[PDB]
Ligand binder design. Sequence first.
Ligand SMILES: O=c1cc(O)n([C@@H]2O[C@H](COP(=O)(O)O)[C@@H](O)[C@H]2O)c(=O)[nH]1
Ligand SMILES: O=c1cc(O)n([C@@H]2O[C@H](COP(=O)(O)O)[C@@H](O)[C@H]2O)c(=O)[nH]1
Lengths: 267, 267
Amino acid sequence: MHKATYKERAATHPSPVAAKLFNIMHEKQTNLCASLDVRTTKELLELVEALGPKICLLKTHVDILTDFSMEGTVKPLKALSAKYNFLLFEDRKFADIGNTVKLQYSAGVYRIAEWADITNAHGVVGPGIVSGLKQAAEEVTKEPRGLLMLAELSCKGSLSTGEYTKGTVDIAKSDKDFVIGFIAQRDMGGRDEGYDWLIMTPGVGLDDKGDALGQQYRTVDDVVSTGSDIIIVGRGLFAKGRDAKVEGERYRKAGWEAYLRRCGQQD
Amino acid sequence: MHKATYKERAATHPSPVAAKLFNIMHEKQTNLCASLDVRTTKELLELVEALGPKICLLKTHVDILTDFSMEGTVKPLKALSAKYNFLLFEDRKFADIGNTVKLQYSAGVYRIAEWADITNAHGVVGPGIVSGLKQAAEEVTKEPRGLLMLAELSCKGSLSTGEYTKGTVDIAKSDKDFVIGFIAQRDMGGRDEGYDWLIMTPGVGLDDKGDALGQQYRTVDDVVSTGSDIIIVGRGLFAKGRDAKVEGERYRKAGWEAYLRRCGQQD
Ligand SMILES: O=c1cc(O)n([C@@H]2O[C@H](COP(=O)(O)O)[C@@H](O)[C@H]2O)c(=O)[nH]1
Ligand SMILES: O=c1cc(O)n([C@@H]2O[C@H](COP(=O)(O)O)[C@@H](O)[C@H]2O)c(=O)[nH]1
């Protein structure tokens, strides 16, 4: 059940973004994605500057930012990404008609399709979302884009249960070049059908138990052994007075060793 | 099965926003919601100006706007709302952790919780969304807010099927004062449990059959007889060279008569 190393899936993955990411993970020995959800670009860029070398991906929520601007938020982030070598993942969770999402994705104020290497969509809308988002991206950029499908959530009461999770996993099979994998809590299979689904899972924390508003955390070792390729950590790195720089190296290392341990697996 | 008039449910509904809306519908004889999805504030406001007197609600997508601004977009909209007497519904479809949605709803750039009388969420996240949005609202305004739950979609391939539709209808029962009803294609019951669920259904059109990217339209008469209280029409009013002013009176009147016809119902 244990998967092939990251360096191998890099030369195996059909998607150029998934390949690069896998390379980044190998290059820097990290499967840690930072989800620095702060309300100002100032601190966002300060947290990114600090996590820069320990992350393989940066998941963003620009619509949470009080002072977003293409010049002051995106331009600097793109640079940071190029400087510290990690990809950009805008966690916008598109979930509307293919026509509506096409506009929300390629244009608007955030112009997400222009800088985001990766994004995601809910399976609710149907398969027409993957095409709406794919077309929207290719209408504004020649750059490689990758889509993740939200198969399961980590908050209390999620409706991404069995059936819905199925329909969603189905939407991802529609485009092996574009759909990189899933935002899920566990392995989603697919290997059998020639799919190298990337599993990125949020709701990870070594200290916090969660909630306040529905959150629930699982340890780094917990999720990894469940088949997680990347661990998405947010308040666990920068919140509650914590030091992003220290937590970054902490989680990055705890995730990398939990990986090397699962690769020693042979069922 | 036929419901009580709008004038009645106004003095019956627990929610101040649903009540006002019902009054607006009675006052102006409209159950027509205009979904003017254009990319510039200029035309959006021109279309609103034209529809202003024929709509009881204006559903918006501010993140589709290339030139959004609180001063240039919201301030003018709020005035139009007050001048022509209709409510503001930001169709943002929140669908993330309660903590993430709390920030995306009350702040960011759009600051939706400050001007939108109504908004909506996907049931996917769990009940923690209703509370995350409710709290976000009461932390930034003393004004009445109302939440609609997306029970069913109208696009090809929707996963808002039976089970998921159930779990969502359940999340709405959690707060009768905040959750006004649903964005659904058909009546969602509840009368029995003391719920006066407002049924707003998009994907309505007298001419277009739909798609291009998954859309599917149903006639005004079709949806109303299905138990729809409000009809959300977009491209059918302003697109394809149409005249928003003429289409507005057209749809508004075709919806009002399909209502007076269902009220003559007695099973
Ligand atoms: O299942 C899910 C999907 C997500 O995208 N997330 C996201 O993960 C992010 C980081 O979470 P946290 O700060 O709790 O570590 C949040 O931005 C959030 O919206 C989640 O918690 N659970
Ligand atoms: O199930 C749904 C829920 C929606 O909110 N909508 C919304 O209704 C709107 C108007 O659609 P149209 O232009 O096709 O008439 C769009 O802004 C869209 O996102 C929909 O079509 N189907």
